[PDB]
A paper describes a structure:
According to the partial reactions that they catalyze, photosystem II (PSII) is a water-plastoquinone oxidoreductase, the cytochrome b6f complex is a plastoquinone-plastocyanin oxidoreductase, photosystem I (PSI) is a plastocyanin-ferredoxin oxidoreductase, and F-ATPase is a proton-motive force (pmf)–driven ATP synthase. The subunits PsaA and PsaB are arranged in a central heterodimer, binding the P700 RC and components of the ETC, namely A0 (a monomeric form of chlorophyll [Chl] a), A1 (phylloquinone), and the [4Fe-4S] cluster Fx, forming the PSI core. The Fx cluster is connected to two additional [4Fe-4S] clusters, termed FA and FB, which are bound through the stromal peripheral subunit PsaC. The unicellular alga Chlamydomonas reinhardtii PSI is much larger than that of higher plants and contains a second half-moon-shaped belt (composed of another four Lhca subunits) and another two Lhca subunits (Lhca2 and Lhca9) on the PsaI pole.
Using negative selection of ultraviolet (UV) irradiation–mutated cells, we isolated a mutant (TSP9) with a single amino acid mutation in the Rieske protein of the cytochrome b6f complex. The PSI protein of TSP9 is not mutated, so the structural alteration can be attributed to the response to stress. Our structural data showed that the mutant responded by lack of assembly of PsaL, PsaH, and two LHC subunits (Lhca2 and Lhca9) in the PSI supercomplex. This structural alteration not only reduces the excitation landscape of PSI but also prevents state II transition, where LHCII migrates from PSII to bind the PSI complex. However, in the TSP9 strain, the loss of Lhca2 and Lhca9 means that the PSI–cytochrome b6f supercomplex cannot assemble under these conditions.
Numbering used by the authors:
A (entry chain A): 12 to 751
B (entry chain D): 53 to 196
C (entry chain B): 369 to 441
D (entry chain C): 2 to 81
E (entry chain J): 1 to 39
F (entry chain F): 63 to 227
G (entry chain B): 516 to 588
H (entry chain E): 34 to 96
The structure:
C-alpha cells in the first residue's frame, strides 16, 4: 500500500552537536590528535553511508540535504533577480538590446578597482555579464525592475520554505524507509506533476504573458506603454486584438477545434527575424505538447489500484537467450542503494547538460541571445563542463556501489554478474579501440604538421589536398534542411539554420547561418571520439575492477578510496576505483577542453561575424578550414592569435580577465607540486620545521602531518582543473567580449 | 594430523566461467588448487570476479597464484566459518601442500614450528651499510 | 651568445643536482659514523633540522615577497 | 625474493601473520615476550612486498621489516 | 546558548570573523587614506 | 638623486604619465551627462589621481627614466637623503605587527598546553583567554627580551626529539 | 626589474638546495623511517603504512629537486 | 619490583623510537624476565596512531 509514513520528533533540535566537531563519526568523535583529523572531518561530512549502516537514517539525511541544496539554489536565483532590479541596466537594454551590453554587477570604488565598471551603455557602468539572464527575463516578458525585485523576494520566501522543509522532514516528521522505497509512486508524480504540470503551467505564463508582451516588444512598442501582464490576463479583448482566436475563449479546446488556436500555437521553426531567437508561439505549442506527453507518462506505474505497471515485473519479464537471468535483481539494487541511483542519475543528467549546450546554440531559444556571442560562448562552455563533471561522478558512484552495495547472493548469472565475468574481454577490446582512434585521429594531425614543415602541402589531409569529408553528417544536414517540404510537411522552416538555408541577421551581426563540415571538422570529431572512448576506458575499468583484479584479489576489502596495496607485486600505486576517477577527471578535462576550443574557433571562424553590404565578414575570416588541420595551426591561429585580448586587457575593464588568466596559469602549475610529489618527502620536511617550533616552544598540540596520499591526489586534480578551466574561462570571456 | 593428498576429481562449485581464470602459466609453470568442505550450498564471490555456488560437502577450485587461493581462504573462514586448504600443482603431476602447512593456521602458535628470518636484536642495532660493502653482492645490514 | 649561455647554465644546473645526489649516496654507502666521531661532517648531521628549517624559512620569505611584489605590480 | 626479518621487539601480537595475504609468516613458541610467542618468516619466497605486515605491526619501531629484493613470478604476484 | 557560543568559538567561525574584521579594517583605511605608497 | 634617479617632482615622464592617465578618464567622462552617476564616479577617480601624483611627489620619492617612483632600501641612503618612509619605517612597523601576532599565538599555545585537552582548545578557541592575550601583546618586544634574558624562550635540546643520525 | 628577477633566482637556488640538502641529511634516516640507510639510496617507498611513505628515498629528493633546478635555470 | 614506578613520568632513550627525548607514563613493568618490560603510554600518537610501546629498563630514565 503506497502511503505517507513518518516518525514524529525523531531528532532533537539542539546546538549540542554543533559544538562537538566530528560527532557523526565513530572514529572522528574522539577529537583531533593530528592535523589529519581536520581533513577527515570535512572529507567524511556528507558520506552518510559511512556514518551509519541504517538505510532509513541515511535516506532521511539525503532528503534533508536535498532541501538544503534547494534552499541554496533559491538564494542564488533571488540574488540574480535582485542584482537585475537594483544593480543592472536591464530597463535601458530592453529599449536598445542591439547596442547596450548586459551588466548586473557593480564594484565599489576602492584600491582603484572601479576600473572594472566598464561603459556597458545605457548610462550605466558595471561588469558585463554573460549568464543570459537579460534575454531570459525579456523572453519571460519582464519589463520593469519592480518585477525582478518581486521575484527576488519570492525566491527568498521559497529559500526560507526549503530550509524549513529540510529541518521539518528531519527533526519533526521524518519519512520512513518504506515511504522512500515507493519508486512507482515517485516516478508517477515526477513525470506527471513536476514535469508535466510544470510544462503546462509554463505554457500558461507564455500564452498569457510571454507571447503578447514579446509581440508588442517586437512590434516596436515602448516597454512603458505595454499592458501589464494582469491587464492581459483579465482582459480578453486586448489578447483578441493581438491573437484573434482569443475572442473564442477556451470553447475550441473542449470542442476539439484546436486549429483555431493556430495563431499562438504554431510550428514555424527557424528563428524570429527581429530578435534572432526561436518563435515563442513555437515554444508555447512545444511546452503544451511536453505537458500532455508527461501527464500521460505519469499514469504508467501501479500505485494503490490494480491499473498500472510493476517495474519489478517489467524487468523480470525482459530476459533473452544470451543474457542468462537478465534484469533480475536490478529492482532490489535500485531501491536499496542510493549510490546506484546516483550513478545512473549523474550519467543521464550530465549527458543532458551537454545536449542542452548544442541545442541552445544551434536553436537559440531567447530573444537577442544569438548575437550576444559572449553569452552564447559562455552558456555552451558552462553547460558542457557541468555535463562532463557529472559524467565522471556517475563513474565514481557506480564504483562505490560495486564496492559497498554489491552482493553476489542477489546477483548470480544476472546481467551485472555476466558483465563482471567478461570484464577482461570488455577492457581489452576497448583498449584496442582507444589505440586505433588515437593513431587514426591525432596521427593525422602529426602527418599534416610534418608534411607542412617539410614543404609538402599537397601530401596533407585538407579540403584542397587529400580530403576526409564527413559525408554522413553532410547527408543528415541536407535531410534535416529539406525536411519541411517532405518528411515534416506542416513545419514552415527547418529546426535550425545550421542544417542550411538562408542566414538570419540581427543588429548587423549573424544570429545563425549554415555550418559547413569539411576535413578539419571530420578530424576534430574523431579527436572527440578518441578522448571520450579513452575517458570511458579509465572510468569503466575502475568500476569493473573495483572489487578485484588479477593483480589484487581483495581490492573490495581495501575499499573504494585507498592509496595502494604497497610496493609489492612490482608496485600497486593507484589501483583503487577512486584513483580511476582521479585519472578520469584529467581525460574528461582534456576531452571537453578540446570540445569547447573546437566550438569557439568554428563559431568565430564560420558563423559569428558582422553582416555588411553584399558579404558576411566572420571574426577569424574563415581560417578554421585551412588552419585547424595541424597542431601548429591550432597553437598559432587559435591560442597565440586569440590570446591578444586577454594579454592586452590591462588598463581596461577586462583587466580582471588578464589577472585571472595569470592567476589560473599559477593554480595549474601549483597543482603539479602535489601531483608529482609524495607525502614521504613532505612529512620529513615538516619534522625539521616542527623541530624549530619545538625549540622556540611554539609547537602545536595537534601534530602537523603531511596530507594523506589520497588527499595529495585530490588536492592536485582540484587545482589542475581549477587552474586549467579558469585559464580558458579568462581567455574566452576577454576574447569574446572584445570582438563580440 | 598428516599431510593431505589432493583428490583432483573433486566436484567444483557451480560457476559459468569468467575471463579472469587460469592462463598459459598453469600449463607451463604451476597453478594452485583450493579445497574445502561445505555443510550447505551457499553462493560466494570468486576472487577472479563473479558469483558461484559452493556444493554440499567437498569443493575444489584452481587459481593462477597463491594470493587468489588465500583470498578465497579468507572469505570462506571469516564469512562461512569453513576451514579450506590449498596446494601448488606443477605441470609434471607433482602436488605440494601449502596451507595450513602444519594443519594449524599460522596465526595460532603451534609447537614444532621452528623460527626463521628472526634477528635477536632491534632494528636500531643494525650495522652501517659501509660494513656490508664489497660483499658477494648488493646486501642490507639487516641480512647479516 | 644566447645558445652558449643557456647551454652552459643548463649543464651547470644538472651537474649541481648530481653533486648533492652523490653527497646523499656518500652518506648512505660510505659514511662511517665511528670514524668521523666529533668531526665537522658528523656535526652537520647533529644540526640537520636547524639547517633544513633555516633553508625552509629563507625559501618561504623569498617566495612570499618576490611573488607578492610581482602580483601587486 | 624479498627479505623479511623479525626483531626481538616482537610482542607476539600475531597481527602481521593475520594481515599477510600470501602466508609468509606464522607464530612460533618464544620466551622473550609475555605472549610466549614470536613471529617467524619461513615462506618469504611467496612474499610480494605488500608490506601489510609492517602496517599491522604496532611496535615502535617495526618488529617485522620487509626489504624489497630480487623479483620473481611469485614476487611480482603474476598470475601469468 | 552555551553550546551555540562554543560553536561560534570553532576554528572556522573565529577565522571568518577575525579575517572579516582584519580585511574590513584594511579596506576602511584605504577608503579614507587612498593610494598609500610611503610613510 | 641616488642611482642617477630624479625627483618625481622634476621628472617630465612623471608629468606625462599623469596627463596620460587623466586623458583616458576624460575621454570616457564625455559620453555621459554632467550629473549622471557615471560622470560623478569618473570625476572622483580623476580627483584621486591628481592627489596621488601630487602626494607622491611631495613625499620626495625619486623616479626612474620610466617616470615611476623607485624605493630606496639602504638604511644609510634613506636616512641621509630623506627616504626612510619608503622601506625603513615600514620595516619596523611590520616587524612590530608580525611579532605581535607570533608572541600572542605562542602565549596562547603555552596557556592551552597546561589544560586537560590542548587539542580541543586549538579547534575550539578559548575566546576570553585569546582576547586577553591579544590586548597584552602590545608590550611583546620587551617581554621577548625579558624571556630571552631569563633563558625561558628556548627549549633544552635534551627535551627535543630528533632522528637517529 | 633586475632586483625582482635576482630575488626570484635566490628563491630557486635556496629551494633547490633545501630539497637536495634535506635529501642528503635525511638519506640515512628520519622520524618517519629511522632505518632508511638499510634500504639504500633508491627504493620505491616503505608502503602506505605510517600515514604513507611515497617519495621518501634520497633519490626521490633528487627527482623533485630537478624540477626546481629546471625552474631556476 | 625492578623498573620505574607505575604512573611515574620517564623520558624515552630508544633512538629509532618516535618518542625519543619525549616523556611518557609508566603503565606497568613486567617483573618476569622479558627483554622490554616497561610499558609506557604517550599523549601524542606516532605516525601509526599508536600511543603506547614497550622499552627496556635502560631505554627509560625518570624525567
Ligand atoms: C537552528 C536549527 C537547527 C539546529 C539547532 C540543528 C541541529 C542539529 N542537526 Mg540539523 N538541520 C537543520 C537545522 C538545525 N539543525 C535544517 C534547516 C536542515 C535542513 C538542511 C537540517 C538538516 C540536518 C541533517 C540532515 C542532519 C542534521 C543533524 C543535526 C544534529 C547534528 C548536526 C549539526 O547540527 O552540526 C552542525 C552542522 C553544520 C553547522 C553544517 C552546516 C551545513 C550548512 C547548511 C552548509 C552551508 C554550506 C554553504 C551554503 C556553502 C559553503 C561554501 C564555502 C565556500 C563557504 C544537530 C543536533 C544531523 C544529525 O541528525 O546528527 C547526526 C543530520 O544528519 N540536520
Ligand atoms: C506533484 C508531486 C510531486 C512533485 C511536484 C515533486 C517534486 C520534487 N520532488 Mg518529490 N515525491 C513525490 C511527489 C512529488 N515530488 C512523492 C509522492 C514522493 C514519494 C514517493 C516523492 C519523493 C521524493 C524524494 C525522495 C525526493 C523528492 C525530490 C523532489 C524535488 C526534486 C528536485 C527537482 O528536480 O525539482 C526542482 C525544484 C523545484 C522546481 C522547486 C519547487 C518545489 C515546490 C515545493 C513544489 C512542491 C513539491 C511538493 C511535493 C509539494 C507538496 C508540498 C507540501 C507537502 C507542503 C522536486 C521539487 C527530491 C528532494 O529531495 O527534494 C527536496 C528527493 O530526494 N521527492
Ligand atoms: C496552468 C495553465 C493555464 C492557466 C492557469 C490558465 C488560465 C486562464 N486561461 Mg488559459 N490556456 C492554457 C493554459 C492555462 N490557462 C493553455 C495551455 C492554452 C492553450 C489551449 C490556453 C488557452 C486559453 C484561451 C484561448 C483562453 C484562456 C483563458 C484563461 C483565463 C480564463 C480561464 C477561464 O475562462 O475559466 C476557467 C475556470 C477556472 C479557472 C476555475 C476557477 C476556480 C477558482 C479559481 C476557484 C476559487 C475557489 C475559492 C474557494 C473561491 C473563494 C475565494 C476566497 C477569496 C474566499 C485564465 C486566467 C481565457 C482568457 O484569456 O480570458 C481572458 C481564454 O480566452 N486560455
Ligand atoms: C548530485 C551530485 C553528487 C552527490 C549528491 C554526491 C555525493 C557524495 N559524493 Mg560525489 N561526485 C560527484 C557528484 C556527487 N556526489 C561528481 C560529479 C563527481 C566527479 C568529480 C564526484 C566525485 C566524488 C568522489 C571522488 C568522491 C565522492 C564522494 C561522495 C560522498 C561523500 C562526499 C564527501 O566526500 O564529502 C565532502 C565534500 C567536500 C569536502 C567538498 C570538497 C570541496 C570541493 C571538492 C572543492 C571544489 C572547488 C570549489 C568549488 C572551489 C571554491 C573556490 C575556492 C577558492 C574556495 C557523497 C555521498 C566520496 C565518497 O564516495 O566517499 C568514499 C568520494 O571519494 N564524489
Ligand atoms: C662524472 C659524472 C658522474 C658520474 C661518474 C656518475 C656516476 C654514477 N651515478 Mg650519477 N649523476 C651525475 C653525474 C655522474 N654520475 C649528474 C650530473 C647527475 C644529475 C643529473 C647525476 C644523478 C644521479 C642519480 C639520481 C643517480 C646517479 C647514479 C650513479 C651511479 C650509477 C648510475 C648509472 O650510471 O647507471 C646508468 C645510468 C643511466 C642508464 C642513465 C639513465 C638514462 C637517463 C634518463 C638519460 C636519458 C636521456 C635521453 C637519452 C634523452 C633522449 C633525448 C633524445 C631523444 C633527443 C654511478 C656510479 C645512481 C646511483 O646512485 O646508483 C644507485 C642514481 O641514483 N647519478
Ligand atoms: C607554480 C608552481 C609551484 C609553486 C608556486 C611552488 C611553490 C613552492 N614550492 Mg614547489 N614544486 C613545484 C611547483 C611549485 N611550487 C613542482 C611542479 C614540483 C615538483 C613536484 C615542486 C617541488 C617542490 C619541493 C620538493 C619543495 C617545493 C617547495 C615550495 C615552497 C618554497 C618556499 C616558498 O617559496 O615559499 C613561498 C610561498 C608561496 C609562493 C605561496 C604563496 C602564498 C599564497 C599563494 C597566498 C595565499 C592566497 C590566499 C590568501 C588564499 C588562497 C587559498 C584560498 C582557497 C583561500 C613554495 C611555496 C619547498 C617547500 O616545501 O618549502 C619548504 C620544497 O620542499 N616545491
Ligand atoms: C609582500 C607583498 C605585498 C606588499 C609588501 C604590498 C604592499 C602594499 N600594497 Mg599590495 N598587494 C599584494 C601584495 C603586497 N602588497 C598582492 C599579492 C595583491 C593582489 C591581491 C595586492 C594588491 C594591492 C592593492 C589593490 C593595493 C595594494 C596596496 C599596497 C600598499 C598599501 C600600503 C597600505 O596599506 O598602507 C599602510 C597600512 C598600514 C600602515 C596599516 C598597518 C596594519 C596595522 C593596522 C597597523 C598596526 C601598527 C601597530 C603597500 C605598499 C594599495 C596601494 O595603494 O598601493 C600603493 C592598493 O591599492 N596592494
Ligand atoms: C644588509 C646589506 C647592506 C648592504 C649591501 C649595504 C651597502 C651600503 N651601505 Mg649600508 N646599512 C645596512 C646594510 C647594508 N648596507 C644596515 C642593516 C644598516 C643599518 C645600520 C646600514 C646603514 C648604513 C649607513 C649609515 C650607511 C650605509 C652606507 C652603505 C653604502 C656604502 C657603505 C659601505 O661602505 O659599505 C657597505 C655597508 C655595509 C656592508 C654594512 C652597513 C653600512 C656601513 C656600516 C656604513 C659605513 C658607510 C661608510 C661611511 C662608507 C660611506 C662613506 C660616506 C659616503 C658616508 C653601501 C652601498 C653608507 C652610505 O652610502 O650612506 C650614504 C652609510 O653611511 N649603510
Ligand atoms: C551493439 C551490440 C549488439 C548486440 C546486442 O545488443 O544484442 C543483444 C543480445 C541479445 O540479448 P537477449 O535477447 O539474449 O537478452 C536481452 C535481455 O537482457 C533484454 O534485452 O545480448 C547480447 O548478447 C549482447 C552481446 C554482447 C556484445 C558483444 C559486442 C559488444 C559491442 C561493443 C560495442 C560495438 C560498437
Ligand atoms: C620574539 C618573537 C619571535 C622570534 C623568535 C626568534 C628566536 C627569532 C630569531 C632571530 C634570529 C636568530 C636572527 C639571526 C640573525 C639575524 C640577523 C643577522 C639580522 C639580519 C637583518 C639585517 C641584515 C637588516 C636588514 C635591513 C634593515 C636595517 C631593515 C630594512 O631596511 C630592510 C634591510 C634588509 C635593509 C617569535 C617566537 C617567532 C614570534 C614572534 C615574536
Ligand atoms: S610484505 Fe606482504 S606478502 Fe610479504 S610478509 Fe609482509 S604481508 Fe606477507
Ligand atoms: S605485528 Fe609485530 S609485534 Fe605483532 S607478532 Fe607481528 S612482528 Fe610481532
Ligand atoms: S609509492 Fe605511495 S602509492 Fe605507491 S606503493 Fe608506495 S606508498 Fe603506495
Amino acid at each position: 500500500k503506497v502511503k505517507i509514513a513518518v516518525d514524529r520528533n525523531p531528532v532533537e533540535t539542539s546546538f549540542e552537536k554543533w559544538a562537538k566537531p566530528g560527532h557523526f563519526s565513530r572514529t572522528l568523535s574522539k577529537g583531533p590528535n593530528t592535523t589529519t583529523w581536520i581533513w577527515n572531518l570535512h572529507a567524511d561530512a556528507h558520506d552518510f553511508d559511512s556514518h551509519t549502516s541504517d538505510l532509513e537514517e541515511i535516506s532521511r539525511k539525503v532528503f534533508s540535504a536535498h532541501f538544503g541544496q534547494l534552499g541554496i539554489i533559491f538564494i542564488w536565483l533571488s540574488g540574480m533577480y535582485f542584482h537585475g532590479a537594483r544593480f543592472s541596466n536591464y530597463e535601458a537594454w530592453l529599449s536598445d538590446p542591439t547596442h547596450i551590453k548586459p551588466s548586473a554587477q557593480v564594484v565599489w570604488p576602492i584600491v582603484g578597482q572601479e576600473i572594472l565598471n566598464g561603459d556597458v551603455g545605457g548610462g550605466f557602468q558595471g561588469i558585463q555579464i554573460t549568464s543570459g539572464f537579460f534575454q531570459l527575463w525579456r523572453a519571460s516578458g519582464i519589463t520593469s525592475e519592480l518585477q525582478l525585485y518581486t521575484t527576488a523576494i519570492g525566491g527568498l520566501v521559497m529559500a526560507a520554505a526549503m530550509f524549513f522543509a529540510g529541518w521539518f522532514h528531519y527533526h519533526k516528521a521524518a519519512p520512513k524507509l518504506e515511504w522512500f522505497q515507493n519508486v512507482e509512486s515517485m516516478l508517477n508524480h515526477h513525470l506527471g506533476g513536476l514535469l508535466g504540470l510544470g510544462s503546462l503551467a509554463w505554457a500558461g505564463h507564455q500564452i498569457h504573458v510571454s507571447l503578447p508582451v514579446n509581440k508588442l516588444l517586437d512590434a516596436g512598442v515602448d516597454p512603458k506603454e505595454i499592458p501589464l501582464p494582469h491587464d492581459l490576463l483579465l482582459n480578453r479583448a486586448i489578447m483578441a486584438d493581438l491573437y484573434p482566436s482569443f475572442a473564442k475563449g477556451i470553447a475550441p479546446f473542449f470542442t476539439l477545434n484546436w486549429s483555431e488556436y493556430s495563431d499562438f500555437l504554431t510550428f514555424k521553426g527557424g528563428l524570429n527575424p527581429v530578435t534572432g531567437g526561436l518563435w515563442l508561439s513555437d515554444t508555447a505549442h512545444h511546452h503544451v505538447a511536453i505537458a500532455v506527453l508527461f501527464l500521460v507518462a505519469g499514469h504508467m506505474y501501479r500505485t494503490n489500484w490494480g491499473i498500472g505497471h510493476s517495474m519489478k515485473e517489467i524487468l523480470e519479464a525482459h530476459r533473452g537467450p544470451f543474457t542468462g537471468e537478465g534484469h533480475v535483481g536490478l529492482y532490489e539494487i535500485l531501491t536499496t542503494s542510493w549510490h546506484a541511483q546516483l550513478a545512473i542519475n549523474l550519467a543521464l543528467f550530465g549527458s543532458l547538460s551537454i545536449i542542452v549546450a548544442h541545442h541552445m546554440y544551434a536553436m537559440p531559444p531567447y530573444p537577442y541571445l544569438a548575437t550576444d556571442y559572449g553569452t552564447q560562448l559562455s552558456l555552451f562552455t558552462h553547460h558542457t563542463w557541468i555535463g562532463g563533471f557529472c559524467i565522471v561522478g556517475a563513474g565514481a558512484h557506480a564504483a562505490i556501489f560495486m564496492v559497498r552495495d554489491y552482493d553476489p547472493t542477489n546477483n548470480y548469472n544476472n546481467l551485472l554478474d555476466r558483465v563482471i565475468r567478461h570484464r577482461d574481454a570488455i577492457i581489452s577490446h576497448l583498449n584496442w579501440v582507444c589505440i586505433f582512434l588515437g593513431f587514426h585521429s591525432f596521427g593525422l594531425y602529426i602527418h599534416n604538421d610534418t608534411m607542412s614543415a617539410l614543404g609538402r602541402p599537397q601530401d596533407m589531409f585538407s579540403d584542397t589536398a587529400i580530403q576526409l569529408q564527413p559525408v554522413f553528417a553532410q547527408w543528415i544536414q541536407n535531410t534535416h534542411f529539406l525536411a519541411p517540404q517532405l518528411t515534416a510537411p506542416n513545419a514552415l522552416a527547418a529546426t535550425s539554420l545550421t542544417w542550411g538555408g538562408d542566414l538570419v541577421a540581427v543588429g548587423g551581426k549573424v544570429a545563425m547561418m549554415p555550418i559547413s563540415l569539411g576535413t578539419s571538422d571530420f578530424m576534430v570529431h574523431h579527436i572527440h571520439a578518441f578522448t571520450i572512448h579513452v575517458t570511458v576506458l579509465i572510468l569503466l575499468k575502475g568500476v569493473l575492477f573495483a572489487r578485484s583484479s588479477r593483480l589484487i584479489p581483495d581490492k573490495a576489502n581495501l575499499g573504494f578510496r585507498f592509496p595502494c596495496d604497497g610496493p609489492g607485486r612490482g608496485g600497486t600505486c593507484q589501483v583503487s576505483a577512486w584513483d580511476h576517477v582521479f585519472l578520469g577527471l584529467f581525460w574528461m578535462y582534456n576531452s571537453l577542453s578540446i570540445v569547447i576550443f573546437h566550438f569557439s574557433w568554428k563559431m568565430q571562424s564560420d558563423v559569428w561575424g558582422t553582416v555588411t553590404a553584399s558579404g558576411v565578414s566572420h571574426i577569424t575570416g574563415g581560417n578554421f578550414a585551412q588552419s585547424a588541420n595541424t597542431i601548429n595551426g591550432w597553437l598559432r591561429d587559435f591560442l597565440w592569435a586569440q590570446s591578444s585580448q586577454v594579454i592586452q586587457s590591462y588598463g581596461s575593464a577586462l583587466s580582471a580577465y588578464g589577472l585571472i588568466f595569470l592567476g589560473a596559469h599559477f593554480v595549474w602549475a601549483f597543482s603539479l607540486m602535489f601531483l608529482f610529489s609524495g607525502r614521504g618527502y613532505w612529512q620529513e620536511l615538516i619534522e625539521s620545521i616542527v623541530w624549530a617550533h619545538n625549540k622556540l616552544k611554539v609547537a602545536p598540540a595537534i601534530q602537523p602531518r603531511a596530507l594523506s596520499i589520497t588527499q595529495g591526489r585530490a588536492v592536485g586534480v582540484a587545482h589542475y582543473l581549477l587552474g586549467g578551466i579558469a585559464t580558458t574561462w579568462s581567455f574566452f570571456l576577454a576574447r569574446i567580449i572584445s570582438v563580440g | 594430523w598428516t599431510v593431505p593428498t589432493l583428490n583432483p576429481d573433486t566436484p567444483s562449485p557451480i560457476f559459468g566461467g569468467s575471463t579472469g581464470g587460469l592462463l598459459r602459466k598453469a600449463q607451463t609453470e604451476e597453478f594452485y588448487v583450493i579445497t574445502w568442505e561445505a555443510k550447505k550450498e551457499q553462493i560466494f564471490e570468486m576472487p577472479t570476479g563473479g558469483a558461484a555456488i559452493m556444493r554440499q560437502g567437498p569443493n575444489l577450485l584452481k587459481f593462477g597464484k597463491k594470493e587468489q587461493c588465500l583470498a578465497l581462504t579468507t572469505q570462506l573462514r571469516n564469512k562461512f566459518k569453513l576451514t579450506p586448504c590449498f596446494y601448488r600443482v606443477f605441470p609434471d603431476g607433482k602436488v605440494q601442500y601449502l596451507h595450513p602447512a602444519d594443519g594449524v593456521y599460522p596465526e595460532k602458535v603451534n609447537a614444532g614450528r621452528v623460527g626463521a628470518n628472526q634477528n635477536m636484536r632491534r632494528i636500531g642495532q643494525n650495522v652501517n651499510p659501509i660494513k656490508v660493502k664489497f660483499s658477494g653482492r648488493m646486501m642490507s645490514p639487516a641480512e647479516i | 651568445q644566447a645558445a652558449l649561455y643557456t647551454h652552459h647554465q643548463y649543464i651547470a644546473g644538472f651537474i649541481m643536482c648530481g653533486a648533492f645526489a652523490h653527497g646523499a649516496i656518500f652518506f648512505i654507502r660510505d659514511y662511517d659514523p665511528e670514524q668521523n666521531k666529533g668531526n665537522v661532517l658528523a656535526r652537520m648531521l647533529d644540526h640537520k633540522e636547524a639547517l633544513i628549517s633555516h633553508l625552509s624559512w629563507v625559501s618561504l620569505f623569498l617566495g612570499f615577497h618576490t611573488l607578492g611584489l610581482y602580483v601587486h605590480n | 625474493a624479498h627479505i623479511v626479518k623479525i626483531y626481538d621487539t616482537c610482542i607476539g601480537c600475531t597481527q602481521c601473520v593475520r594481515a599477510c595475504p600470501l602466508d609468509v609468516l606464522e607464530m612460533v613458541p618464544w620466551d622473550g615476550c609475555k605472549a610466549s610467542q614470536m613471529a617467524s618468516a619461513p615462506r618469504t619466497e611467496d612474499c610480494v612486498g605488500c608490506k601489510r605486515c609492517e602496517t599491522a605491526c604496532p611496535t615502535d619501531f617495526l618488529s617485522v621489516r620487509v626489504y624489497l629484493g630480487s623479483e620473481s613470478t611469485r614476487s611480482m604476484g603474476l598470475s601469468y | 546558548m552555551k553550546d551555540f557560543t562554543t560553536y561560534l568559538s570553532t576554528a572556522p567561525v573565529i577565522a571568518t570573523i577575525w579575517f572579516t574584521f582584519t580585511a574590513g579594517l584594511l579596506i576602511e583605511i584605504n577608503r579614507y587614506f587612498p593610494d598609500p605608497l610611503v610613510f | 638623486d641616488i642611482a642617477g634617479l630624479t625627483p618625481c617632482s622634476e621628472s617630465k615622464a612623471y608629468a606625462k604619465l599623469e596627463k596620460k592617465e587623466l586623458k583616458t578618464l576624460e575621454k570616457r567622462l564625455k559620453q555621459y551627462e554632467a550629473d549622471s552617476a557615471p560622470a560623478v564616479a569618473l570625476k572622483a577617480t580623476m580627483e584621486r589621481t591628481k592627489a596621488r601624483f601630487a602626494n607622491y611627489a611631495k613625499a620626495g620619492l625619486l623616479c626612474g627614466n620610466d617616470g615611476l617612483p623607485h624605493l630606496i632600501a639602504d638604511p644609510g641612503l634613506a636616512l641621509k637623503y630623506g627616504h626612510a618612509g619608503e622601506v625603513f619605517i615600514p620595516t619596523f612597523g611590520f616587524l612590530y605587527v608580525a611579532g605581535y601576532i607570533g608572541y600572542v599565538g605562542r602565549q596562547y599555545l603555552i596557556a592551552v598546553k597546561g589544560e586537560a585537552k590542548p587539542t580541543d582548545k586549538e579547534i575550539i578557541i578559548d575566546v576570553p583567554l585569546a582576547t586577553k592575550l591579544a590586548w597584552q601583546g602590545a608590550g611583546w618586544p620587551l617581554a621577548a627580551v625579558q624571556e630571552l634574558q631569563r633563558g625561558t624562550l628556548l627549549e633544552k635540546e635534551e627535551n627535543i626529539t630528533v632522528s637517529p643520525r | 626589474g633586475d632586483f625582482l628577477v635576482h630575488h626570484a633566482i635566490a628563491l630557486g637556488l635556496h629551494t633547490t638546495t633545501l630539497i637536495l640538502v634535506k635529501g642528503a641529511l635525511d638519506a640515512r634516516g628520519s622520524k618517519l623511517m629511522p632505518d632508511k640507510k638499510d634500504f639504500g639510496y633508491s627504493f620505491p617507498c616503505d608502503g602506505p603504512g605510517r600515514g604513507g611513505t611515497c617519495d621518501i628515498s634520497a633519490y626521490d629528493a633528487f627527482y623533485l629537486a630537478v624540477f626546481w633546478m629546471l625552474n631556476t635555470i | 619490583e625492578v623498573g620505574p614506578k607505575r604512573g611515574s613520568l620517564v623520558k624515552i632513550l630508544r633512538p629509532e623510537s618516535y618518542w625519543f627525548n619525549q616523556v611518557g607514563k609508566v603503565v606497568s613493568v613486567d617483573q618476569s624476565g622479558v627483554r622490554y618490560p616497561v610499558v609506557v603510554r604517550f599523549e601524542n600518537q606516532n605516525y601509526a596512531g599508536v600511543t603506547t610501546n614497550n622499552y627496556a629498563l635502560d631505554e627509560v630514565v625518570a624525567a
